Every structure is written in C-alpha cells, then in structure tokens.
Amino acid sequence: VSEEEWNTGETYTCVVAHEALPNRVTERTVDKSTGKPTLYNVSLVMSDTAGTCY
Amino acid sequence: IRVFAIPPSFASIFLTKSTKLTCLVTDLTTYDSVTISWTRQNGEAVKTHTNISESHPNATFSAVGEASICEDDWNSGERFTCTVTHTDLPSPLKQTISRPKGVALHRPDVYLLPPAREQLNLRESATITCLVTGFSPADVFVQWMQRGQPLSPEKYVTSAPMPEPQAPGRYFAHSILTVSEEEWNTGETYTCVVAHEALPNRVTERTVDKSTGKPTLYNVSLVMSDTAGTCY
Amino acid sequence: ESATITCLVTGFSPADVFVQWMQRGQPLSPEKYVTSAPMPEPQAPGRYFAHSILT
Amino acid sequence: ERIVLVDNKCKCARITSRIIRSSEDPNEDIVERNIRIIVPLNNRENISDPTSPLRTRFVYHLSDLCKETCYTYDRNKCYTAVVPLVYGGETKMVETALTPDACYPD
Amino acid sequence: KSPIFGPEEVNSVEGNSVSITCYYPPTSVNRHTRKYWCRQGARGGCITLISSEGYVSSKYAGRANLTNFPENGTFVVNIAQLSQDDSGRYKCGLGINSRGLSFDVSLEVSQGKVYTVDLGRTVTINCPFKTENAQKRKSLYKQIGLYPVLVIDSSGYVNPNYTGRIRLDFSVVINQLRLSDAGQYLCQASNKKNADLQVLKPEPELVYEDLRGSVTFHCALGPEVANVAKFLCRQSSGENCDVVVNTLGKRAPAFEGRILLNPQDKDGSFSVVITGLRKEDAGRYLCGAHSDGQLQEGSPIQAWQLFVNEESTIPRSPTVVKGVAGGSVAVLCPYNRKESKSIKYWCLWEGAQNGRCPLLVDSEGWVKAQYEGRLSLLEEPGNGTFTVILNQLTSRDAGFYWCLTNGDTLWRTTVEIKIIEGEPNLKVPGNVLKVPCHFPCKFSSYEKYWCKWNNTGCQALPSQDEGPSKSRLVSLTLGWYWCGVKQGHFYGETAAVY
Ligand SMILES: *[C@@H]1O[C@H](CO)[C@@H](O[C@@H]2O[C@H](CO)[C@@H](O)[C@H](O)[C@H]2NC(C)=O)[C@H](O)[C@H]1NC(C)=O
Ligand SMILES: *[C@@H]1O[C@H](CO)[C@@H](O)[C@H](O)[C@H]1NC(C)=O
Ligand SMILES: *[C@@H]1O[C@H](CO)[C@@H](O)[C@H](O)[C@H]1NC(C)=O
Ligand SMILES: *[C@@H]1O[C@H](CO)[C@@H](O)[C@H](O)[C@H]1NC(C)=O
C-alpha cells in the first residue's frame, strides 16, 4: 500500500480460507490504531466507598 | 384496669402472611366474663379468637383478643374496634385501630456504625449501632445476625421510630448490639437486616467486622500484569 | 447530603440524663438534635442507656 | 476522539486507546494505553456473600479482561443473598437485596 | 460519555422562576436511583442543593422542589425566587455526586417603549407626537456610537443597513428583523421618544432520542411564511448551516433513505422524520423559511436540539440485507414489545424533497397489486419481532425499506436491500398435479414446506419427503404459491411459482 495511507489507516482485513474451520474464514485485521503503544498511562484510583462501577 | 390495642406490623404481614390483629387487656382486676369483640366501622362482627391467657403471678390479669382480616381490607384504611365488656368498667370500651391512609413510602438508608476506639480500650464491651435513617411510615424491623446465624433478642435494643430532625415527614430508628471486646477483635462479621415496606425485595442488610469498618490500616496490594497485551 | 453524628450515653443509672450539643462553645438549637428517652439495657442489670443524634 | 477497547464493569477496568496526531513532523505519532482501574477497598472477596474476608490482592491481567471473580458490583445488574430472619416461631429465610435501587421488580 | 441531557444554558431574571428538566435512560436503576442537583462551586465538588430522596438544602429551603417522572423518563427542578447568587455552574444527575452520570447546566441570572420579537418577524415601532408638527419630517434614527445615525427619513431614504424592508405608518413598521438589528432606537418629529427592540434567539426544544431510533421534528410556522421554501439546516461548529433537507430539492449525501419531509398542512406545519440516528447527529437542528433554502438573515427559524443516547434498549437489527436477483430476502423488523397488538405496515423510499413512503403491505391484509404473489408479512417470531419475506427480486427493487407500526412510540427501522447479481439459491419450474421444489444441502436442518399465498399469508399444504436428490427435493401433490424453508422459528429462502 502507499505509506501515505498510514496516517488514515483503512484497517486492512486479511481473511484466510482453510478446511479445518467452521466458516472456513479466520479474518483478521491490523491498522495503525492497533499495534504497540509507546505511551502508557495507568491511572488507578482508590476509594473506600467505591464498589458500584458506574 | 387499662387496655392496649395491637394492630399488625408490616413485618408480621409480610413475614408470616397472617395479618391478624389483637387487643390485650391488662392492669385489670383478676375477674372473669371477658368478651373482647372485634367490630368493623359498620358495627358488623368478624371471626372469633382463642387462647385467652391467664392472670399474673403479680395478680393483674392479662388477656388477648384476636381476629384475622385480609390484607386488602387492612390497606384500605377501614376502622376496626375492639369492645371490652367487663364487670369492672360499666361502659364496654372501644379501642379504635386503622392503618392511616395518605402517607408516602420512602426508603430507609441503613448505615451501620462500628464501636468507638475509646470503648475498645476498656476491654469490656463494644457496641455496634445500626442506624436506619430517613424512612416512612413507621415500623422498621431491625434484627441482627452474627456469622450467618440470627442473634438472640436479649442482645440488641431497637429503638422506636421518632421523626427525624430536619426532614419533615420521615422517621428514623436505631439498634445497638453489645458484643464483648474479645469477640470483636477476632473478626466476626455482624449483619444488620431491616425489613420495610418501601425496600426492594422488602429486606436489606448491611455488615461490618473489625477490618472493613473504620479501620486504622489500609493494606492494598494491587498487581497489574500483561499491560501491553493484545487488546481489541 | 447530611451527616448524623451520634452520642451514645451508655451504662448509667438512674434515669434523667440530659444531653445537649455545642458547636465551638455556644450550644446549638434543640431543633437539630433528637435525644431518645432512656431505655433499659438488656445484657447488663438495671442500668439504662440513651442516645442522641445531631444532623 | 478515543476508542474504548475494554469497559469491564466487574473489575472496573477501562482500557482505551488513542493516536496522538503530533506536531506536524513525520509519522512520530504515539499510541496510548489509558488503563483506568478503580479499586474497591471495602468490598469483600465473595462479592455476594458479605460474611467473607475483605480483599488484599487486586490482580488485573489485562489480557484476560480484553478477550469470573468480580471486585465491584455492577450498577445495573442486581445482587441478592438469603438470610434466616425469624419473627416469632419460624425462621423464614427471605431474600434480601445487597445493592438496592437495582432490585426493584417491574 | 454520560447519557443525561438537560438544558445547556438557562437564562432568567431575578424574582422569576426556573424549570430545568433533565432526562435519563429509563432503565430500572435509573428510575429508582437518587437524583440530585448539585452546585459545582469553585475549589471543589458538588454540594447537593436538592436531592430527590428528600433532602433540600439550607439555601434552597422553601424555594425549590425536585420531582421525578420515571415513565416520562425525566426529572424536573423548579426553583422560584432567583437572585444573583443563583448564578454559576450546576449539575443535574443521578447516583452519587462524584461518579459522573450528570449534566452541566450553567445558570445565568439577569437584572431587570419596549419591544421583544423573534427573528425575521414584523414589529411596529410606535411613537407619539404633538399637533404642531403634524406635517413635519418625521423620522426614526438608531443610537450607535453616541449619535443618532440615519435609518428612516420621510422623503424616501432607507439605509443600506436597512434596505427596503421597512414602511412607515404615527408609527413605523419594520420587517425581517435580524439579530444584528436588535437596536435601541429613537424617534423624532420638536419632541422625541426613545425606542427599544430586543430580538431573541429562538431557544432549544430538547429532544432526547435513541441510538438506532428515530425522531420527528414538528416544524410549525406562520401564515407569513407558508409559501416560503422551508428547510432544515444543522448549525455546525462554525456559523454555517450544512443544510439537510429543502423543499426545492436538496438533501444530504449522508441522510440517504432516511429523511421524510412530510407534506405541508394548511397551517404550514410540515414535519420531518429522521430515522436510524447514529452518534453524529447529536446537535442543533434548525427548521426555517427563507427563499433560497440556505440559512440567511430575515428567516423565521425555530431551532431544536437532539441528543442521541448510547445506552439504548433498541436491538441491533442488520441494516443491509443482500438478496440475489430472482432470489429471496427475509427481514425482521423489531418493534416495542409492549406494543405487540398493533397494525404493522411497510414502505418504499422516494427521495426527501418528495419525502414519500407509500404503504406496501400491512397486518390487516392489504398488499399493493404490483407486489402480489411475491410478498408476505409474517408474525412469527412474536415476543418482539415481525418478519417480512419478499422474493422474485429485480434490479430496481433494491432500496430503503421502512418497518412502520401503528404504535405509540415508533422505531421506524430502515433496512437496505442490495440487489446484487447472482443465481437463485432455490430452483423451481418457470410458470406452471405435482410441482417440485429443489433445495440445496445447506438447508438440511431447515423444514421444507409450501404455502398458499393470499392477502392472509401462508397456510400449510402437505407433501412427502425423499432421500438424496441432486441436497433435497419436495413435491406439491394436489394463484401464486411458494416453497420456502423454516429454521425453528425464523424464515429463510422462498421462491414463487404461478
Ligand atoms: C459465595 O460464592 C459462591 C461461589 O463463589 C456463591 O455461590 C452459590 O451461589 C448461588 C447463587 O446465589 C447460590 O444459590 C448457591 O447456593 C451458592 N452455593 C453455596 C454453597 O452457597 C455464593 O452465593 C456465595 N456464598 C453465599 C453464602 O451466598
Ligand atoms: C493518558 O495519556 C493521555 C495522553 O498522554 C492524556 O491525555 C491523558 O490525560 C492521560 N490519562 C489520564 C487519566 O490523565
Ligand atoms: C504494608 O504493605 C507492605 C507491602 O505490600 C506489606 O508487606 C506490609 O505487610 C503492609 N503492612 C501493613 C501493616 O498492612
Ligand atoms: C498486609 O497485606 C499483605 C499482603 O496480603 C500481608 O502479607 C500483610 O501481613 C498485611 N499486613 C498485616 C498487618 O496483616
């Protein structure tokens, strides 16, 4: 594909077709949005009276 | 020679499906010829009773005049009246009983307070106070349980619903249980169950032990793992 | 919304305790707290308690 | 702008992600992993049996919640237990409501 | 995002009262959970001024009440006796104060001839005079820049800022008031008088709708703007309105198949249906009446405000049904499970400027004559759905197909038929006592059956089964009739014969 596609993505599914499958389809996809993060941020908050998970 | 009239609580309606109503006659002289007839607003009679009790060792007679009605009759605010016909009182008195219509339902907020750390220093006793705030109408039914087993009624004292200070038409209640300080510094989850006619399944319950409620030590130990992962 | 602080006057005898509440030195209104009448304590012998909430 | 990868509500994890369109240099764009755990700290181990010990370990394998023992109540799902309350003779085991305002039947 | 939705901006003068509604997704938690209205102060947090359990604060005591309509799906806060300490930043919400589930109202109180008009209308600026000047050069000037600039003179001058749109009664009538012209004027004959003209911007009319639901904009306008070419813009992030319908033709590349501009009434109260609302429709919409179908000044607009909540109870039916030519489609339209006993209908698609949706079938029975033989509305499965089967396809009967119902609250589900090229999945004689029907081996679990088609649907007709047949083959031992399949409770591929 064009390198210029990889600011906009378009998500690029690649579907295989084999005989040991239910659908005979094991479609997968990877875009720029998938793949490695290079900036985490855990943000875990703690609170006596939580426990409802809105 | 007094008289008491006992309308059914909601936690006798809901909990035994037996909306029977009584009026007890005590303080009277130990005489006989008791007739305690339950009559509606139209004067008409209802079913009779049994098990009219004994006098006291203390020589003041105690009797109990029972009837059974249906639930839909009781909720419609009908006037019921027991008439006591004794040889002492020359007027056969009426005690009037009605479930007063027009009151809203509100839900009790049950907060359960653990014993003060000024009290767990004497090593004698600890007092846990269930606090049933803000409900309506009266008649909450607090009872306690220790480790899934119902505690004996000699140990807790539930108060009566006195109306709340700021809130206009909403009551509140209390219940204190005295557990010995060795039985609290072991663990020993206690639960406070309340039953009231505006709660969801009619019943709710709270719990506390040494380690949950007002602790002096918060020991979190969290672990995240595989934080990269392959997440879709 | 609102906090209910509770004073648990336990263990005494005879009746007629009198609980009142002060903030910083000058006493509060009696419209805000609710003292129960004394009730007898069941585990201990004939010694009462009471309680009084302030909201 | 961001896409929710996981919104798990019985551990309360909430992994999302977002591509940061940077200063307009080449493709030095970054991708994030904004985990947001919220730790209960007064819920029991068995969430439904409230006579259990408290909790110490809160373990979040974030593969095994990207694809149980829940830590928090979910808000919409409603929880119960059954207690032996008495009133007189019988021990009528009736059905309580751990979290109320969710177990109201229609 | 948090699905409560209130009024984003509230304006009311001191002493007057406020009613603030906030909506919630009517679950069984949200009906019964605590509903607050807290004041987001500075330095921190909500301070609950009036909860719904029954707390009412020290400040709002005697002047506020919060009620809760759980079936309407909303809760309303009435606040009387405003002051200027009632200005600032508020939240209406549910549950605990901290955990979101809220909306942010910004309360903003204001201090107390005269005129107050909405946009584009008329107004009659009236001014008294004396008898000694009963022929003089009467005039109206505008106070900008500490000097009356000329607007209306007697001899026939009107301003370039006010060209032509105003005549002179004494008094003076202006027409097509635009918001820039909301000025505090003055009138002169040697006497004078002031003149004051506020022109309000027409307020939102909050519409909390659902994801994959539908919405009906009820545009009601006046006998001055009956024949003006009505429209519906959508005021986006700048000042421009990317128009969505028109009456002179236009529509959007986005809203294909979905906008239905209904015909005018005698009152000019045309209505607009949007369906299949997705998350990017959630903003201000504006019906209006200007000539050239774009948003211009002088146009009696009347806005709305959508909100498309994401916490739907609406189920996710497939939007694209793909049928092969001369094949079969079998679509399910979902409908409100409370509203089971009602008269279903179906539809075509015919543009927006037309904005039509004529009825193909129903549940009482009446089918269009040009669809007879190939069409049947079903009822199985019940408990939530109703199925429609259409076969004997065609290149031009692909389109957008609306699943109406005669219920109260309506989800006009639109399903899209894609007529691809293809071969039939079922083989039947051309146009025909025994008739055969030849089923592929994929329908092995499916129950093979024939129908007698009418306006009443399918009634059963017996047959006997064979073994392996080049798959499956069934007989019709013995108008239009079909030989479809059935999978437990749903329906699949049917093919018709004469
Ligand atoms: C403790 O957790 C167990 C499983 O970890 C729960 O399991 C059973 O839960 C169902 C659902 O209410 C009950 O009908 C069963 O009777 C439970 N099993 C047993 C042996 O009690 C259980 O709910 C939790 N404990 C309690 C006492 O509720
Ligand atoms: C996580 O990182 C992003 C980008 O660096 C940032 O915008 C966001 O605020 C961070 N998360 C929290 C909880 O602050
Ligand atoms: C405090 O945390 C540490 C770290 O996990 C632990 O080893 C220690 O025992 C804890 N102490 C208490 C008093 O909980
Ligand atoms: C605190 O938690 C850790 C981990 O469970 C435990 O090992 C430690 O003993 C705890 N502290 C106390 C005082 O129990």
Side-chain angles (χ1 to χ4, degrees):
Chain A
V1 310
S2 90
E3 185 262 352
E4 298 91 352
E5 203 85 9
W6 266 54
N7 264 32
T8 83
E10 280 91 11
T11 198
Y12 284 110
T13 57
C14 171
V15 43
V16 83
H18 196 249
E19 84 194 14
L21 312 162
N23 207 338
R24 308 161 312 169
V25 156
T26 327
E27 181 172 1
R28 288 179 190 265
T29 182
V30 181
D31 201 335
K32 168 69 170 304
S33 54
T34 319
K36 298 277 269 200
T38 43
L39 165 53
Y40 286 72
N41 35 351
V42 193
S43 166
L44 60 101
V45 327
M46 286 152 45
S47 43
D48 179 2
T49 171
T52 331
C53 205
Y54 275 50
Chain B
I1 310 96
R2 296 168 70 113
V3 60
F4 278 161
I6 311 170
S9 63
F10 171 78
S12 155
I13 295 166
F14 147 75
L15 218 40
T16 73
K17 308 164 295 306
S18 290
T19 165
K20 74 161 210 165
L21 82 172
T22 66
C23 81
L24 162 136
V25 283
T26 193
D27 196 19
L28 77 152
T29 71
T30 75
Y31 299 173
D32 206 80
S33 178
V34 285
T35 293
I36 306 169
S37 194
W38 276 108
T39 54
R40 320 212 174 186
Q41 73 294 328
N42 279 1
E44 50 173 351
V46 310
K47 60 172 297 193
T48 42
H49 38 279
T50 333
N51 213 59
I52 310 294
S53 199
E54 59 178 57
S55 282
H56 272 320
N58 305 155
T60 165
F61 178 52
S62 62
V64 278
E66 187 271 338
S68 188
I69 313 304
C70 186
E71 190 212 333
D72 280 323
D73 312 8
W74 173 252
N75 279 120
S76 76
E78 305 215 13
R79 289 233 156 194
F80 294 164
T81 35
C82 72
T83 176
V84 302
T85 83
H86 202 45
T87 57
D88 200 339
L89 262 284
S91 160
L93 291 104
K94 293 274 196 179
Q95 277 299 318
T96 316
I97 280 183
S98 180
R99 195 209 193 270
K101 314 188 82 202
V103 290
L105 316 179
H106 302 319
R107 188 169 75 224
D109 325 337
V110 184
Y111 323 104
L112 206 162
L113 308 176
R117 65 147 190 83
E118 332 162 4
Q119 182 181 13
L120 312 170
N121 271 2
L122 319 182
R123 309 303 161 119
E124 296 173 1
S125 277
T127 296
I128 321 163
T129 86
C130 204
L131 169 49
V132 197
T133 320
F135 55 89
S136 197
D139 194 78
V140 75
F141 163 67
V142 191
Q143 84 151 16
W144 288 68
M145 300 190 322
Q146 165 186 70
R147 203 53 77 99
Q149 301 216 45
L151 270 192
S152 319
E154 286 161 309
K155 286 175 171 280
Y156 47 84
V157 181
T158 171
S159 148
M162 301 161 194
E164 207 183 358
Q166 318 295 336
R170 287 152 139 273
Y171 301 146
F172 87 112
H174 255 262
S175 197
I176 42 181
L177 163 78
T178 42
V179 289
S180 38
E181 202 264 357
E182 198 53 272
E183 290 280 324
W184 205 67
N185 268 325
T186 298
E188 290 283 343
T189 288
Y190 301 99
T191 47
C192 171
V193 327
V194 325
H196 181 269
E197 67 162 356
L199 272 167
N201 272 315
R202 300 320 196 192
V203 167
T204 186
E205 66 153 357
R206 304 295 148 105
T207 169
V208 83
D209 64 45
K210 178 183 159 49
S211 301
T212 84
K214 288 252 167 183
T216 44
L217 203 150
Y218 265 150
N219 185 352
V220 197
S221 172
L222 68 143
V223 40
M224 290 180 41
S225 155
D226 284 328
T227 180
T230 331
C231 285
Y232 325 96
Chain C
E1 282 178 5
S2 270
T4 291
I5 320 156
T6 160
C7 198
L8 188 78
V9 200
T10 200
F12 59 92
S13 153
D16 295 323
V17 75
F18 163 67
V19 176
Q20 55 154 42
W21 291 82
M22 309 156 34
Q23 178 187 329
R24 294 180 199 162
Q26 45 269 23
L28 281 153
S29 298
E31 180 251 309
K32 301 175 62 176
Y33 58 89
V34 165
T35 314
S36 100
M39 316 203 178
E41 207 172 356
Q43 181 90 272
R47 315 166 80 175
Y48 308 125
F49 55 83
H51 46 61
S52 161
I53 79 158
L54 164 76
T55 178
Chain D
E1 203 176 316
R2 47 193 61 174
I3 50 163
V4 174
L5 268 56
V6 162
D7 210 329
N8 196 19
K9 282 181 205 299
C10 92
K11 300 192 177 286
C12 219
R14 196 193 157 273
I15 317 183
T16 163
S17 178
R18 174 169 83 112
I19 310 168
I20 298 186
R21 310 289 184 92
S22 83
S23 86
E24 314 297 333
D25 265 21
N27 43 52
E28 48 199 85
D29 298 25
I30 324 169
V31 191
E32 278 91 63
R33 188 55 36 143
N34 318 141
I35 304 144
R36 196 192 65 111
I37 313 295
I38 289 178
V39 181
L41 193 54
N42 253 342
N43 276 314
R44 315 288 207 148
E45 287 194 330
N46 206 351
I47 211 71
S48 297
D49 184 28
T51 95
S52 319
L54 192 57
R55 279 300 304 183
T56 304
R57 317 280 328 283
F58 302 99
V59 191
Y60 309 98
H61 313 299
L62 316 171
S63 70
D64 305 346
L65 53 95
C66 272
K67 66 176 55 178
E68 216 183 6
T69 71
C70 321
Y71 294 149
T72 77
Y73 299 96
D74 192 354
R75 182 174 96 102
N76 290 273
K77 184 194 171 323
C78 114
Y79 295 79
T80 47
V82 164
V83 301
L85 63 96
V86 277
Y87 191 65
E90 198 49 41
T91 69
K92 288 280 192 177
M93 306 186 63
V94 298
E95 202 137 30
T96 86
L98 259 69
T99 193
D101 69 77
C103 304
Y104 274 93
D106 197 10
Chain E
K1 208 195 193 158
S2 74
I4 318 289
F5 162 68
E8 288 79 3
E9 43 263 350
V10 192
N11 306 268
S12 270
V13 185
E14 313 162 33
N16 253 320
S17 43
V18 183
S19 177
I20 284 172
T21 48
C22 294
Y23 297 79
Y24 50 93
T27 325
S28 179
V29 167
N30 294 261
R31 279 193 218 281
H32 298 288
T33 206
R34 181 189 89 109
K35 296 152 180 32
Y36 56 88
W37 157 262
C38 57
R39 188 204 194 96
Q40 164 97 27
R43 169 69 87 149
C46 280
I47 310 162
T48 302
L49 300 184
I50 168 174
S51 163
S52 152
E53 305 287 271
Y55 178 51
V56 160
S57 171
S58 38
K59 180 183 278 189
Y60 279 25
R63 38 184 294 207
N65 25 337
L66 197 149
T67 93
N68 171 39
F69 316 133
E71 42 262 1
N72 210 332
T74 164
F75 65 99
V76 59
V77 178
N78 302 264
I79 299 163
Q81 299 161 33
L82 296 162
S83 158
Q84 292 197 0
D85 63 18
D86 281 28
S87 167
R89 261 194 46 75
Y90 287 99
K91 301 171 65 190
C92 57
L94 272 73
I96 309 182
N97 281 275
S98 92
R99 306 299 205 102
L101 246 183
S102 89
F103 185 75
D104 319 319
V105 185
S106 75
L107 194 48
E108 196 84 42
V109 291
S110 199
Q111 187 194 96
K113 263 287 284 192
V114 70
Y115 299 113
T116 293
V117 200
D118 198 279
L119 296 165
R121 301 295 179 173
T122 316
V123 74
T124 309
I125 302 187
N126 222 317
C127 286
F129 74 116
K130 72 198 173 43
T131 48
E132 208 202 41
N133 314 330
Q135 43 83 26
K136 283 189 52 215
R137 185 202 54 94
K138 311 187 184 70
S139 173
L140 161 82
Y141 309 107
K142 192 182 171 201
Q143 300 279 159
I144 180 54
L146 217 53
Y147 196 83
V149 62
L150 259 64
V151 174
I152 300 308
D153 288 34
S154 90
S155 88
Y157 169 71
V158 297
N159 197 276
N161 304 281
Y162 286 87
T163 173
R165 60 181 93 166
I166 166 163
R167 308 189 307 112
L168 179 135
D169 280 20
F170 84 117
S171 184
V172 50
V173 284
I174 207 166
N175 265 304
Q176 306 229 334
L177 273 179
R178 52 181 288 161
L179 179 142
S180 181
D181 285 353
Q184 287 83 248
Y185 298 4
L186 170 142
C187 44
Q188 175 180 354
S190 315
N191 43 359
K192 293 182 198 182
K193 206 189 83 173
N194 68 336
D196 173 35
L197 271 82
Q198 188 177 354
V199 182
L200 327 104
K201 193 88 167 285
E203 63 273 30
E205 305 193 9
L206 318 169
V207 184
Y208 177 92
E209 289 299 325
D210 211 337
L211 189 82
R212 313 156 308 218
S214 157
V215 68
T216 318
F217 287 81
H218 272 296
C219 184
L221 287 160
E224 37 176 349
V225 297
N227 318 118
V228 196
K230 307 173 146 64
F231 71 99
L232 180 135
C233 85
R234 200 270 214 196
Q235 191 182 21
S236 201
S237 183
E239 207 267 325
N240 54 358
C241 274
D242 36 336
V243 195
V244 155
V245 211
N246 208 312
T247 208
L248 53 87
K250 210 165 182 288
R251 51 198 305 255
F255 292 113
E256 69 176 63
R258 316 196 286 170
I259 285 283
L260 193 156
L261 187 139
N262 262 307
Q264 198 96 334
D265 299 7
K266 269 66 69 185
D267 300 318
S269 158
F270 84 107
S271 161
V272 173
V273 187
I274 317 181
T275 167
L277 305 160
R278 328 185 167 112
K279 321 191 305 165
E280 60 252 3
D281 310 319
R284 210 184 272 267
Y285 278 76
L286 279 86
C287 87
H290 195 233
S291 158
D292 48 286
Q294 292 265 342
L295 189 125
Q296 304 208 1
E297 326 295 353
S299 50
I301 67 187
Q302 179 204 3
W304 269 267
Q305 173 97 36
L306 202 71
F307 183 99
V308 176
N309 81 285
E310 312 101 11
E311 314 277 337
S312 283
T313 189
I314 292 189
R316 198 168 172 95
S317 284
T319 168
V320 191
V321 53
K322 279 166 196 174
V324 305
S328 90
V329 302
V331 302
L332 279 58
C333 306
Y335 76 123
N336 204 347
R337 199 176 139 190
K338 303 301 193 75
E339 214 56 46
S340 156
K341 274 303 308 179
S342 156
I343 293 96
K344 280 85 175 173
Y345 291 90
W346 258 69
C347 251
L348 200 41
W349 167 249
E350 283 85 2
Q353 78 290 319
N354 315 321
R356 275 144 163 103
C357 208
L359 327 99
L360 298 190
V361 306
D362 44 82
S363 182
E364 300 289 84
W366 170 76
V367 191
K368 218 168 65 71
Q370 280 82 341
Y371 280 77
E372 284 199 354
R374 67 207 191 116
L375 197 36
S376 161
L377 180 137
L378 276 302
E379 295 302 314
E380 168 79 11
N383 219 36
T385 87
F386 84 102
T387 313
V388 171
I389 312 175
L390 168 85
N391 50 4
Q392 212 294 304
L393 297 178
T394 285
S395 89
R396 74 171 204 281
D397 287 335
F400 299 92
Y401 271 71
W402 283 28
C403 314
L404 277 76
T405 298
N406 213 6
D408 48 357
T409 294
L410 258 186
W411 325 334
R412 296 166 192 85
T413 298
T414 297
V415 65
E416 206 186 4
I417 311 179
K418 270 206 214 310
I419 293 304
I420 50 183
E421 57 85 33
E423 89 296 329
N425 325 303
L426 205 62
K427 261 72 69 173
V428 169
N431 270 339
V432 58
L433 176 83
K434 198 220 72 184
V435 201
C437 191
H438 277 100
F439 301 87
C441 199
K442 189 61 181 177
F443 306 160
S444 71
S445 55
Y446 300 169
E447 303 151 344
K448 273 79 59 189
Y449 79 113
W450 274 77
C451 300
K452 39 170 71 64
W453 187 91
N454 201 356
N455 275 357
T456 177
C458 280
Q459 291 169 146
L461 205 48
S463 200
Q464 307 265 35
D465 188 37
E466 315 184 356
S469 314
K470 292 292 296 173
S471 60
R472 186 51 52 198
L473 155 67
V474 82
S475 42
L476 186 77
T477 167
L478 267 195
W480 293 76
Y481 315 97
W482 319 347
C483 46
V485 300
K486 170 138 200 288
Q487 36 183 355
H489 295 288
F490 312 144
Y491 287 87
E493 287 98 315
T494 73
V497 76
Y498 210 106

